Symmetry: C3
Subunit: 495 residues, 3 copies
Amino acid sequence: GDRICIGYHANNSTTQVDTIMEKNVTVTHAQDILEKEHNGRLCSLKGVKPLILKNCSVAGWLLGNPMCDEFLNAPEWSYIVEKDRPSNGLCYPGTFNYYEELKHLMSSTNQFEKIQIFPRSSWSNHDASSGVSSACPYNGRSSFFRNVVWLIKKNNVYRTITRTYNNTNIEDLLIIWGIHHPNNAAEQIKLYQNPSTYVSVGTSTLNQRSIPEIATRPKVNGLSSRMEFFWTILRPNDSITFESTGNFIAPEYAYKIVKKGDSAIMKSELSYSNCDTKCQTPVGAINSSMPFHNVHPFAIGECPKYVKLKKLVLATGLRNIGAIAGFIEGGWQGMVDGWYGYHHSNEQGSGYAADKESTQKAVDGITNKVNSIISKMNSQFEAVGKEFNNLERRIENLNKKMEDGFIDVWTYNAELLVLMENERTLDLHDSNVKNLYDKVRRQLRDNAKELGNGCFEFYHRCDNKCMESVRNGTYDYPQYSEESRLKREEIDSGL
Amino acid sequence: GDRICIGYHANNSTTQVDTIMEKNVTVTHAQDILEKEHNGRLCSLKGVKPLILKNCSVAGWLLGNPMCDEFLNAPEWSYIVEKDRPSNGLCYPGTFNYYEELKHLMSSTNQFEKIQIFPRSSWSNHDASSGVSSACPYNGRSSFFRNVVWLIKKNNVYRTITRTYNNTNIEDLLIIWGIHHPNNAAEQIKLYQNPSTYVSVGTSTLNQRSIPEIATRPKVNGLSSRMEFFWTILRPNDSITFESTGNFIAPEYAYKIVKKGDSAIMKSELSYSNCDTKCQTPVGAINSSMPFHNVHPFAIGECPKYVKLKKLVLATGLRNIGAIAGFIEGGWQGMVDGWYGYHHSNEQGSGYAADKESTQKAVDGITNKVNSIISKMNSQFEAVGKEFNNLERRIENLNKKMEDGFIDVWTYNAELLVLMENERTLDLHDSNVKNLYDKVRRQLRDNAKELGNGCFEFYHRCDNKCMESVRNGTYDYPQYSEESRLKREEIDSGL
Amino acid sequence: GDRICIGYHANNSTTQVDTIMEKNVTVTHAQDILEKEHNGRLCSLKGVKPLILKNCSVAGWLLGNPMCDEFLNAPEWSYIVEKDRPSNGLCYPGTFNYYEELKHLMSSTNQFEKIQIFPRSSWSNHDASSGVSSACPYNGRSSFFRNVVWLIKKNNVYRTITRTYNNTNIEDLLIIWGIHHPNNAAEQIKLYQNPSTYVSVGTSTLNQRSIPEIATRPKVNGLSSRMEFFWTILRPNDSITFESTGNFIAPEYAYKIVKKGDSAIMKSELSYSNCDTKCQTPVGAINSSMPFHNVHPFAIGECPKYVKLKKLVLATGLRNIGAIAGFIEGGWQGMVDGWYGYHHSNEQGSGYAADKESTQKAVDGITNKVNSIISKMNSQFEAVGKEFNNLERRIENLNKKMEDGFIDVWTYNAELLVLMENERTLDLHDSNVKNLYDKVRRQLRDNAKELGNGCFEFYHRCDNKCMESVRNGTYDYPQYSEESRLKREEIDSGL
Ligand SMILES: *[C@@H]1O[C@H](CO)[C@@H](O)[C@H](O)[C@H]1NC(C)=O
Ligand SMILES: *[C@@H]1O[C@H](CO)[C@@H](O)[C@H](O)[C@H]1NC(C)=O
Ligand SMILES: *[C@@H]1O[C@H](CO)[C@@H](O)[C@H](O)[C@H]1NC(C)=O
């Protein structure tokens, strides 16, 4: 007898980590940092609801297609939800110039207030009720975009229109108008008498004369005619003037941009639920407690960072081992209040005491390294939705390559940091156990024989109050010097 | 005598590696991973030939400039080759709107099938044979684009054209038409009588009226007139209708997109050879066995990853050293079947046996680390060709900066991984040799004297069947305890 | 007595470094690499002055707004400075097509030479002096853009203009013209008689007919009319022809691009000073000696690399410690000519000599690692200025995300390299001190007793010429073997 041993923790764990050099390394303690679950619902963002467009496209909502809900309350929103191929858009077929730019402006917008600039009932010189069609039904009736007025000749005359709106508000106004492209020349005369007409609109910053492009087109939604829409932002104190002799599709209502901020247009097929989250993806919301996720690259809100992986586990503690009588062999199930420690084999002792002098010194620098690692990606790339028209394929692909590019880079960065510091964390543990050993043997020098399994045998008596002398770096060799100095020349000439 | 020594490999090698801290570190084993050679030819990709446009530009080929080869067989292709400044393009000078977008669509296209929608002989009301010119020769004759028909007034009349094609195919159709811009008003009447005309074309998704812009231009390829071409993709079940009173350049043939996939437009000056590769660059093909190359950033196919370096060598084994009598001094030329081992100096022994218990334990985790390193770049950035017109310089430069940006990032990533793990690989070797040592000395404790050069001298007799006891971690001190216990108190009072 | 100790440097320093695992680690030697100061002035770049546009926009300068300075000397420039919202632009209101593309061309341009292609006095058939207005004053007079001529009907007639310039120079010419959009039809007749007119311009590569868009606009700078400008680059040996019946704004002077190279348009509010730098940011110039800075992302010239951090310090030497009698405790203030060394406690000795065999071996591989680290970012991303119009928001944001993306990536890269190699540098120091120790104990084997504080006590006499035997790896045990062999069996049976 008369022994003491230097040893490390081992316990129930079967969680596994990876390094650069080995896979599936089981460890005592380990911290998952990759969130991979989601709730499949569409939720409010920190208490602010999304704008759910249902089956309507942004164009349909703004122009007020008869099938789309208006938002009379003028609510603010946290983001906008639009299905992948909405069914309710330009019910009257045509185009909507710079549509994609407008959707991009919607991403920085959180609240519209609709206001009337040119009231439907104020066009005295023109027909303001006939402009409706079988292509824009509202309860089976022919109807039209609620927000623009399709003016039509009155009494076979269409007197040249000039009309202005001075924007006296403090807010930017979104203003939408349009122009009508008939099938043929009879149609042009039938609706607007004047055979040759234009739609001119003037701003301080915007000058545009628009001309009816008459052509022969296939029937879309029942018609071969088309309607082309335009939009502009009228700055505070600026004014806009419209002049047309025909084919004018006149704004009735405009949109005051009353709140700018962090918003988004999310393409998703879900509908809303009584649910709230900090982080919303198109396929559902995320419990944003972890630092990384792989649910979906287009998450919005207070989100963890997207990485293309299926596992991401940090190591925090030792490897896991029975495991008998020293550190050379393995870890001690029997140690509980620490990571590295000792074992009293004494005339009274039984064993198992932890050196928390170096144990909290580890839980200090690892759990300060785990936080410091997470924060190293604070500025990691986050992707952002944008759309592109069929003639913008190159910049679409530029944008796709740029976003996939950064996601790959940051995925590489994350995996490497975890693998690299996992190798450093485990090797630290080895180091501490090896260093605990030396602290002990640097003390009991001649008074003890290293057995090479990780323990020392005493050439003297220690007693229990001395087995803390080695624990407290306070054992003095001279205390038992001459004692032991005798009793292993007794080995030298023993049996 | 009576010795044993712990030692490591050394051999013929003179291959050199680098770390963060040292350059030109010669090593025993090392794996080049940077492919830097190419074959200078243009080859088929995994058995599928490129489309070689010879001296023709994409525009020339599609419109069918008389000098360009048609591809009547409708072959599929692996990529398209176009010279840097092709000589055969718009032989009749003009423009080709959204040309660059069209070339970008060609990059996702692998096979056209040409089909006739409006046969040359079906324009009964117009001259369909006079439209040719000195600017588009075919064997010294005046001629024209084979794929579009330059219709001209018949009998001094040009009756307004309306004509339609319903796309009854399952495939997208590429359709190209154009319009003619004369020098002056006499020219306009001379060819198309009607003084004021248009070219209108209608699709479900496309509405366009085109008007002759008459102006006074310098002679290009002999003419001051110009021709402007347009293109659109007619979706399955859609139809297209053309209406013009003059200046119409009517499609005869359209292109069925029959195979989409991974393709490219490669700018290169080479011509084809009886050659096949897995990876093709503009200056030649690559033997894609390595994971990295520096030949050219625009490689296509099953390619290694492009990095801007001139060397990239992984270390796999020890440093290289004569080298005499222990690990403290250097490695042993005399060891052959392993990386770390021992040396029998015995009453019979001679020496040199490898501890493959820890040698295959290295060839396990290094050759698993070399594969694991290569795969860490599976998702590395790969550049993609695109073109831009003279008014698209900003997005050209955006695209150039984005691609150079990722190449630099991934070059940094590759070099750092190799240097960082090269430092870890060599230091592991040191560790294993130091650890082999301890395994031995943890066994022979009192029975042997460490000489500090890396060897032990025995205070007892071992014999050959004991020199495997230390090799198999199975030497028991008590076996020879009392033996040695005697014979170095014999040193204590020897000479 | 009779001792010797292995020890390391410690000194005045209080500079602190960081690693992955610890912050605020004080060290003996350390190298700041982050430049954070700037001089707040706008300086010449390596002796070449910027073009300071003062309150003029690029458009104002090129067209020659009466308030802007011309640069008659035709100076070359190192970059161009433009205020954020310049006050002197299109004094006559309108638009300037592809303005942003033109500014992007200015970034690769370092020198214009202005030349006259169509002299003001050569329009014999038109009024060339009346075209001025209250909106372009020059000393309180009505005036006009100095570089283009606003031609006006003469004697109530405006004879159709055709006019050409053959570019006989070797240099690309920048040519700017424009066209006038009146308020109403009376205005059109009042200035240009002909009711319906155009401005046509023909190049080999450029075909354009421009038509007056008459509309009713709010007064900008006093007028409701507008002027629209166009630009093109006329290649050497090419010619350009202008044809108009009215509304033509004719070039007088063109700009020969005589020097292309590295340039920039810097948005900044500063004005020039008698100052010169190697690196200029919009808020001031930088003393480009360091490798990294955080002053401003849009620096130009021979600049260090921009990273978003507030500190970036490399470690080069030991940690800093009184510190008494061995390496186990701490470093020695008393060592001066090295980093690791020894201490003579001899019958004559006092102590403190450095092992420069391993000290210069450190100042070799650290100060080769500090250079090698800096150069690892040679190809780091550098941001570049570009501008975008109000309908280019998507590519603006693409470009912003791409640049912020790379800055974040490279910031991550820089911090990690410094933290990672700081951990490697300090741990090397530990290694060297631990290795110096072993070199000594591998020599004095039986002749000395390790005291476990980092020192050895001698069982024999050494003398001063032997205390270099341990220093020069040349101590032979047999020299004092039988001596010591006696005198610690004297301990074995001493007191
Ligand atoms: C949306 O379209 C689907 C058809 O798939 C329909 O069943 C659903 O009721 C529609 N919802 C709204 C709000 O229009
Ligand atoms: C391509 O142009 C070159 C002129 O440099 C000519 O010699 C060669 O024969 C041409 N090849 C084809 C296929 O037109
Ligand atoms: C620029 O504008 C400011 C007005 O803030 C004026 O005081 C200054 O003199 C102007 N400088 C020039 C060169 O026009």
